[PDB]
Amino acid sequence: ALGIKSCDFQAARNNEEHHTKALSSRRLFVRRGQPFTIILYFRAPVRAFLPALKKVALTAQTGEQPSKINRTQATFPISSLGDRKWWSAVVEERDAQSWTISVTTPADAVIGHYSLLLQVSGRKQLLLGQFTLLFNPWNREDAVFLKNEAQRMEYLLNQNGLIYLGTADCIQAESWDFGQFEGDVIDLSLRLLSKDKQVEKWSQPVHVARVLGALLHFLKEQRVLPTLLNKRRGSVPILRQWLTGRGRPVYDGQAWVLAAVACTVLRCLGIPARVVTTFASAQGTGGRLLIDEYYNEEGLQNGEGQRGRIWIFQTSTECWMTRPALPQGYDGW
Amino acid sequence: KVYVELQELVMDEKNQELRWMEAARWVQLEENLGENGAWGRPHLSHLTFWSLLELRRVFTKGTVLLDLQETSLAGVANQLLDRFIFEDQIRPQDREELLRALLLKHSHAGELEALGGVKPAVLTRSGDPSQPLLPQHSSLETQLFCEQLEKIPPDSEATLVLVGRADFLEQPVLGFVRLQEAAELEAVELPVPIRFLFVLLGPEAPHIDYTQLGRAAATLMSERVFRIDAYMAQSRGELLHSLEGFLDCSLVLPPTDAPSEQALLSLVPVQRELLRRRYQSSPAKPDPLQQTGQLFGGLVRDIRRRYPYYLSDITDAFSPQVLAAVIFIYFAALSPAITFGGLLGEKTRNQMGVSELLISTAVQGILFALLGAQPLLVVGFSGPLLVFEEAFFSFCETNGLEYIVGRVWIGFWLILLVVLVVAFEGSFLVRFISRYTQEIFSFLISLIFIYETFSKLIKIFQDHPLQKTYNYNVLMVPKPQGPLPNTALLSLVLMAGTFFFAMMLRKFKNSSYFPGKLRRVIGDFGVPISILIMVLVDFFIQDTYTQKLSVPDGFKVSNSSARGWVIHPLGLRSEFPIWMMFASALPALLVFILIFLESQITTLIVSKPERKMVKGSGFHLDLLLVVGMGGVAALFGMPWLSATTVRSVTHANALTVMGKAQIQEVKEQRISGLLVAVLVGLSILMEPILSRIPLAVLFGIFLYMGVTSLSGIQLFDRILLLFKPPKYHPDVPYVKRVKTWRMHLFTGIQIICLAVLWVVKSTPASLALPFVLILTVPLRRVLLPLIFRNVELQCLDADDAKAT
Amino acid sequence: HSSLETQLFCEQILEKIPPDSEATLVLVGRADFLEQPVLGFVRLQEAAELEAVELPVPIRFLFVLLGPEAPHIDYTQLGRAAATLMSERVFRIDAYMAQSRGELLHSLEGFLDCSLVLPPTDAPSEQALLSLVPVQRELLRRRYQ
């Protein structure tokens, strides 16, 4: 006598509460460590609330082989005694035909695509719907926590960036569309992350940043071509072309866009990130603190160049997180 | 009316000479020419959107030659090309190529087989037909109507559409010519004058199919309103006006992924209104359980329902599955016949024995298969009938009445009742036997069958018990007078082995092993294969005694000193009393009630809509035939037979074909029952074959029939749900719209009825079973609504397993 | 004058809608100050419950058809044609995946190449309509494969 009619995930209101409204108003995007509200609808009125509450449990799974050991599968009841710092569910408001349920996730939860399943004593599992779990720069217990609201708005919510190019004495700001909230960017980022098989480490921003940074550098090496060709429309078309092979390729004169693409994928996953430009960067030294430049008697250079050169500028991605595996004091950028 | 001929420019295959060949022809209805050289079936013309959108564009800038003075294809072509060049439709350098094309040989079809067929082509500048460059599309009309002339009025005038492709063209061109006087042309072989000429030429452009373009032009000319306008048209503008009324009264049918007849029949008002608007501006005008109230009305409708299908009732049996079903039902009908014949014989001093029952079963089965409206029924003797007979043989033995002579009168009164019932359509009351009563009756009868099958083995174990020591010399004639070693255990082994082999072959039928055809052939013959295997197994064990099938010596009366083949309605030995002639009505009433309930409920069960019975069943005809044959049988001292539930269900199951779990079709035919009855009659002649068949093998076959008769019973399904958690219940209407405890209460109410019926069977008042069974109908239609809601009863007790 | 469908069918919903179903709003109007008829086709990035136009389901597609009075242009019938186009499965799939106008016109030409015209034929209505069943069945053999 506890058959479910439908489940409303309330994607608009939850996405507004979770700083995810720019992603969608129909798909549920939630940040780890923060409660979100769903409405459960019953086919028939529920006579006695307490036994019915005793008869139901909720399950959250992520990935293709969810397991309790991987922290990719969690089973929790619906009660006021649930651990709000872990997976939990409590009925906040109820009527005879519906339950308003507040669901929490741990601040160290594995990110990615999740399924919510309901188990009603003496019945088979029922899929309530899908949601995507992200890092939470707004939760004090998250590793990507940011102190300031203004820094949160700038390093995660802003799609309108500025990549600084030019020389040290003549800096030209180029408008850049990061587009982290574009519809497919989250799916593309999670698909790229799925090339890493240590899904249990996807709770760690450090591991996620390192895997995506390496994969994106590999893609940049594979897809950027030797030398309109320089017309750019932001990070999202570049990411689409790098992952799918379709679209306008990027040429080697604009290889600095790797930093912007990495910034876009990190920000879409919820890791605070910024593009930094260093002017007069000595690249290709291997740690050596010397640069050899060779000029002819006319003050000109003959060949294509050395391996160790001083670049006019170089772009880089900086990301915000704690460093639990490092000695104390290295949290931040 | 009028005749219209389309000819497309094509190349022959033998000499590669381009020429003109007919593609289709219209006398109101359109005929198409296939590649073989014959005409396809005549059909209403359907046009494509592109055909019509191109015609209008080419007709808007077309070249009209009205009231034209010519009587030759060459002259018409000359004037047409002249007015083409004058209107700048073609360049003057192309006049030589198009006049060469227009005056080629116009081959009718009579020469298609003489030549090597025709292929599409394009007239090129050099006059050489090359191969078209655009992708080809084989004609949909050819693919649909062709893969398999007296209607022309004498005063009608023909129209010839010529379609051809010529790369030497900037755009498609249309020349429409009306002659002042209708003339005969060398292009048309039919002796009808030609009035209108359609010439459609152009290059191979997108969305222009010239065959479809010519089809559209010919259909427009075949339209009455456009034809009448064209006869009176003095300008191109009037023809263009008539084409706008054609395209304004046309009905365009867009594609859909759900093609249906009912959805398409909703457009009837649209079609009629479009026709009305098209002809508004024209001068012309446009050219089984139902109670009828009629005496024997149900009988005639039952006769009119099934007898039209009589030819298929013989042809559809031409499959080995039918032969396997025949072998199955032969034993399934012969063994109960022999057992019941031996019992009644013993219980009636051989007045009615094995031979009478065999002959009656054969004759009644033959006449029912050849005449009945539901041939899948098996006509045989039932337990209730053995009980009533003993009831009468006792009553007659008490009151000094003759047995055979009284039963003779019961039929004389049986026929009176069934005739009045068929006359007033009393078989319409069977519409009130819902799935409740049907499934209670079927499940109870199946349980009785299983219980009797096991009790026969129990009796075998009692006759030859397991002992430490036996008498090695025990008389065997007629039956062993003492216990014998190895008999009961071998009987159990043979019965279990036959049942196991039958079930394993039934599994193998649905299995994924072997080629599908061979696997289905072997699975259909599962029961014959099991019977043969176990018969051979028992045959190769010579020493051990096992009880075999026993048939009488000949077609003679079972007691030659009691009665002959006919019984005198007035008495054999003593004068039969007058009062018993009138007093026989009440026992005849009970017999009619028994036979009616059995046969009607059996017909209901075997003809459920979910079994894919698409040939109909006659409640009035089958009842009449069965009860009349029973009444006639008596005059000859032979039993009254009825449609037994288990045998008929097994016959229907053996004739049912399974799809890829889902019932696909049923081999609804008369040959299987006819051959079963013939073999049952010939059982006396084939004693050497039957004498080597143990009863234990047939006991296993009986158990197989009993357990397989429970498939379609929803009561059996809901009983299994009593022992399943309410999580593994399947998604069916009575599960997902009824609470689990409500469904279990509903099942338990039926279980109460089953227990009440089963107790009554095991009492001396076992002839009251039909009335107590009828008492379920008030329970369902009166008491259940007092404790159930309408939706609950609709889901639980459904006519065709529908979710209300 | 009234529409043909109103005179033939009207003189004499949420249960039938599947659950993951979105809406198409076809807007049809006559504006005498426009030089030519204009078609606006909109696919939203995600389905949206527009407050101005409440529908049983979320809107993904908008058809806007406006223009002046012109010959052969019944705007009601044009809206009917656009709605019938959207109700067809192949065009609707092509419309969800379309990235340009050219793909949408290549879907519309396929629909017209699988569209069947019944001319005014003096046969009885039932036989004339039921004769379209095998022709449609053969014409749509490859469209939905």
Domain assignment of residue A106, given as a range: 4-134
The two structure tokens encoding residue B372: 């009945």
Query: How many domains in chain A?
Result: 2
Chain A residues touching C45 at Cβ < 8 A: 183
The rounded distance, in Å, linking the Cα atoms of A242 and B721 is 56
Chain C residues touching A27 at Cβ < 8 A: 46
Instruction: Give CA separation, B564 vs B407, B572, B638, in Å.
Output: 14, 9, 11
The rounded distance, in Å, linking the Cα atoms of A233 and A246 is 15
The rounded distance, in Å, linking the Cα atoms of A293 and A280 is 14
Q: Using DSSP, state whether B182 is helix, strand or coil.
A: strand
Chain A residues touching B727 at Cβ < 8 A: 122-124
**Chain A with chain C: Cβ pairs closer than 8 A:** 9
Together in a domain, A129 and A153: no
Together in a domain, A127 and A249: no
The rounded distance, in Å, linking the Cα atoms of B16 and B4 is 27
Q: Using DSSP, state whether A38 is helix, strand or coil.
A: strand
Q: What does DSSP assign to residue B285?
A: P
Q: Using DSSP, state whether A306 is helix, strand or coil.
A: coil
Which of A68, A99, A134 is the last residue before a domain boundary?
Answer: A134
Which of A83, A104, A134 is the last residue before a domain boundary?
Answer: A134
In-domain check, residue A177: yes
DSSP-derived pairing of the beta strands A28-31 and B194-202: unpaired
The alpha carbon of residue C84 is apart from the nearest alpha carbon of chain B, in Å, by 8
Q: Is B482 exposed, middle or buried (0-12, 13-18, 19+ CB in 10 A)?
A: exposed
In sequence order, the β-bridge partners of residue B657 are: B665
Together in a domain, A162 and A299: yes
Approach to solving: cryo-EM
The rounded distance, in Å, linking the Cα atoms of B723 and B701 is 28
The runs of H, that is alpha helices, within B247-319 are 261-265, 268-280, 297-306, 312-315
The two structure tokens encoding residue B138: 């084989």
Q: Is C63 exposed, middle or buried (0-12, 13-18, 19+ CB in 10 A)?
A: buried
With an 8 Å Cβ cutoff, is A47 touching chain B? no
The rounded distance, in Å, linking the Cα atoms of A159 and A268 is 10
Asked whether the beta carbons of residue C120 and residue B273 sit closer than 8 angstroms, the reply is: no
In-domain check, residue A253: yes
Phi, psi of B18 (to 5 degrees): -70, 145
B contact test, residue of A5, A46, A123 with most B CBs within 10 A: A123
Q: What does DSSP assign to residue B779?
A: I
Helix B383-398 and helix B320-348, axial crossing angle in degrees, nearest 10: 20
Asked whether the beta carbons of residue A183 and residue C45 sit closer than 8 angstroms, the reply is: yes
Q: How far is CA B87 from the centre of its chain?
A: 64
In-domain check, residue A242: yes
Cβ distance B338 to B327 under 8 Å? no
Q: Is B80 exposed, middle or buried (0-12, 13-18, 19+ CB in 10 A)?
A: buried
The two structure tokens encoding residue A58: 């909720």
The rounded distance, in Å, linking the Cα atoms of B40 and A203 is 72
The rounded distance, in Å, linking the Cα atoms of B667 and B665 is 7
Residue type, C18: P
Chain B residues touching A123 at Cβ < 8 A: 726-727
Together in a domain, A159 and A259: yes
Closest Cα in chain C to A184: C45
**Which residue has 């799925």 as its token pair?**
A194
Together in a domain, A76 and A211: no
With an 8 Å Cβ cutoff, is A124 touching chain C? no
Query: Widest CA span of chain A, in angstroms?
Result: 96
Together in a domain, A41 and A189: no
The two structure tokens encoding residue C2: 């009234």
- How many secondary structure helices (H) and strands (E) does chain B include? 33, 17
The rounded distance, in Å, linking the Cα atoms of C92 and C86 is 5
* CA proximity to B32, closest of B195, B219, B178, B199: B219
The two structure tokens encoding residue C48: 């949206």
Cβ distance A75 to A131 under 8 Å? no
Asked whether the beta carbons of residue A25 and residue C45 sit closer than 8 angstroms, the reply is: no
The alpha carbon of residue B533 is apart from the nearest alpha carbon of chain A, in Å, by 45
The alpha carbon of residue C88 is apart from the nearest alpha carbon of chain A, in Å, by 25
Contacts of B82 (CB under 8 A, 6+ apart): none
Q: What angle do CA B209, B213, B216 make, to 5 degrees?
A: 140
Contacts of B229 (CB under 8 A, 6+ apart): B238, B239, B241, B242, B282
Q: Is B538 exposed, middle or buried (0-12, 13-18, 19+ CB in 10 A)?
A: buried
In sequence order, the β-bridge partners of residue B419 are: none
Other beta carbons within 10 Å of B293: 8
The two structure tokens encoding residue B376: 């899948």
End-to-end CA distance of chain A: 54
The rounded distance, in Å, linking the Cα atoms of B58 and B202 is 10
Asked whether the beta carbons of residue B287 and residue C139 sit closer than 8 angstroms, the reply is: no
Cβ distance B164 to B6 under 8 Å? no
Together in a domain, A171 and A128: no
Other beta carbons within 10 Å of B308: 11
Asked whether the beta carbons of residue B46 and residue C138 sit closer than 8 angstroms, the reply is: no
Cβ distance B524 to B672 under 8 Å? no
The alpha carbon of residue A274 is apart from the nearest alpha carbon of chain B, in Å, by 52
Asked whether the beta carbons of residue B727 and residue A1 sit closer than 8 angstroms, the reply is: no
In-domain check, residue A173: yes
The rounded distance, in Å, linking the Cα atoms of A176 and B336 is 92
In-domain check, residue A302: yes
Phi, psi of B6 (to 5 degrees): -100, 135
Together in a domain, A155 and A193: yes
SS (H, E, C) B415-479: HHHHHHHHHCCHHHHHHHCCHHHHHHHHHHHHHHHHHHHHHHHHHHHHHCCCCCCCCCCCCCCCC
**Which residue has 């809601």 as its token pair?**
B789
Cβ distance B199 to B172 under 8 Å? no
* CA proximity to C49, closest of C41, C40, C58: C58
The alpha carbon of residue A186 is apart from the nearest alpha carbon of chain C, in Å, by 15
With an 8 Å Cβ cutoff, is A1 touching chain B? yes
Chain A residues touching C46 at Cβ < 8 A: 24-27, 183
Which of A81, A106, A134 is the last residue before a domain boundary?
Answer: A134
Instruction: Give CA separation, B449 vs B453, B645, B699, in Å.
Output: 6, 10, 11
Contacts of C111 (CB under 8 A, 6+ apart): B254, B255, C85, C88, C90, C91
Q: What angle do CA B44, C89, C75 make, to 5 degrees?
A: 75
**Which residue has 């060779």 as its token pair?**
A294
The alpha carbon of residue B726 is apart from the nearest alpha carbon of chain A, in Å, by 7
Nearest to C118 among B43, B46, B265 (CB): B46
Q: What does DSSP assign to residue B659?
A: -
DSSP string, B375-392: TT--EE--HHHHHHHHHH
With an 8 Å Cβ cutoff, is B726 touching chain A? yes
Interface partners of chain A (CB pairs < 8 Å, 3 or more) are B, C
Cβ distance B680 to B358 under 8 Å? yes
Contacts 24+ apart (CB under 8 A), A72-78: A72/A110, A72/A199, A72/A200, A75/A119, A78/A53
The two structure tokens encoding residue B371: 């005449």
Q: What is the CATH number of the domain that holds A185?
A: 3.90.260.10
Q: H or E element: which one contains B161?
A: strand B158-165
A contact test, residue of B724, B727, B739 with most A CBs within 10 A: B727
DSSP string, A245-278: S-SPPPBGGGTTHHHHHHHHHHHHHT--EEEEEE
With an 8 Å Cβ cutoff, is A25 touching chain C? yes
Asked whether the beta carbons of residue B727 and residue A122 sit closer than 8 angstroms, the reply is: yes
The rounded distance, in Å, linking the Cα atoms of C25 and C62 is 5
The alpha carbon of residue C51 is apart from the nearest alpha carbon of chain B, in Å, by 32
Together in a domain, A128 and A181: no
**Which residue has 């490092």 as its token pair?**
A326
With an 8 Å Cβ cutoff, is C50 touching chain A? no
Contacts 24+ apart (CB under 8 A), B450-454: B450/B703, B450/B706, B450/B707, B452/B702, B453/B699, B453/B702, B453/B703, B453/B706, B454/B703
Together in a domain, A9 and A87: yes
End-to-end CA distance of chain B: 54
Calculated CA dihedral for residues B44, B45, B47, B51, nearest 10 degrees? 180
End-to-end CA distance of chain C: 42
Output b/e per residue, B84-119; b: 16+ Cβ within 10 A: bbeeebbeeebbebbeebbbeebbbbeebeebeebe
The two structure tokens encoding residue A176: 């850049």
Phi, psi of A60 (to 5 degrees): -120, 125
Q: What angle do CA B404, B408, B409 make, to 5 degrees?
A: 125
* CA proximity to B146, closest of C145, C138, C121: C138
Other beta carbons within 10 Å of C69: 10
Contacts of B421 (CB under 8 A, 6+ apart): B427, B592, B596, B623
In-domain check, residue A141: no
The rounded distance, in Å, linking the Cα atoms of B721 and B701 is 28
In sequence order, the β-bridge partners of residue A113 are: A132
* CA proximity to B462, closest of B486, B483, B448, B490: B483
Kindly report whether the peptide bond that precedes residue A205 is cis, defined as omega within 30 degrees of 0: no
Together in a domain, A226 and A306: yes
The alpha carbon of residue A43 is apart from the nearest alpha carbon of chain B, in Å, by 10
Chain C residues touching A24 at Cβ < 8 A: 46
Instruction: Give CA separation, A87 vs A2, A81, A84, A105, A109, in Å.
Output: 23, 12, 7, 5, 9
Rg (CA), chain C: 18
Instruction: Give CA separation, B249 vs B145, C4, C112, C119, C131, in Å.
Output: 26, 12, 18, 7, 18
In sequence order, the β-bridge partners of residue C61 are: C24, C43
Q: What angle do CA B452, B455, B460 make, to 5 degrees?
A: 130
Residue type, A84: R
Q: What is the CATH number of the domain that holds A73?
A: 2.60.40.10
Q: Is B369 exposed, middle or buried (0-12, 13-18, 19+ CB in 10 A)?
A: buried
Region label for B53, one of left (φ > 0), alpha (ψ between -120 and 50) or beta (otherwise):
alpha
Helix B435-463 and helix B585-606, axial crossing angle in degrees, nearest 10: 100
Q: What does DSSP assign to residue A78?
A: B
Asked whether the beta carbons of residue A26 and residue C45 sit closer than 8 angstroms, the reply is: no
Q: How far is CA B624 from the centre of its chain?
A: 24
**Chain B with chain C: Cβ pairs closer than 8 A:** 126
The alpha carbon of residue A183 is apart from the nearest alpha carbon of chain C, in Å, by 8
Interface partners of chain B (CB pairs < 8 Å, 3 or more) are A, C
DSSP-derived pairing of the beta strands B251-253 and C116-118: antiparallel
In-domain check, residue A86: yes
In-domain check, residue A161: yes
Cβ distance A160 to A83 under 8 Å? no
Q: Using DSSP, state whether B315 is helix, strand or coil.
A: helix
Other beta carbons within 10 Å of A76: 17
The runs of H, that is alpha helices, within chain A are 11-17, 49-54, 149-152, 185-193, 205-223, 235-244, 257-269
* CA proximity to A292, closest of A314, A313, A309: A309
Provide the resolution (angstroms). 25.0
The rounded distance, in Å, linking the Cα atoms of B117 and B19 is 11
Together in a domain, A34 and A183: no
Asked whether the beta carbons of residue C90 and residue B43 sit closer than 8 angstroms, the reply is: no
Instruction: Give CA separation, B659 vs B158, B321, B324, in Å.
Output: 54, 15, 19
Closest Cα in chain A to B739: A1
Output b/e per residue, B557-580; b: 16+ Cβ within 10 A: bbbeebbeeebbeeebeeebbeeb
DSSP string, B486-504: THHHHHHHHHHHHHHHHHH
In sequence order, the β-bridge partners of residue C29 are: C66
Q: What does DSSP assign to residue B166?
A: B
The rounded distance, in Å, linking the Cα atoms of A49 and A30 is 28
DSSP string, B680-738: HHGGGTTHHHHTT-BHHHHHHHHHHHHHHTTSS-HHHHHHHGGGS-TTS--S-HHHHSS
Output b/e per residue, B601-635; b: 16+ Cβ within 10 A: bbbbbbbbeebbbebbbbbbbbbbbbbbbbbbbbb
**Which residue has 């008491």 as its token pair?**
B783
The two structure tokens encoding residue B803: 């979710």
The two structure tokens encoding residue B777: 């109908």
Closest Cα in chain C to B272: C125
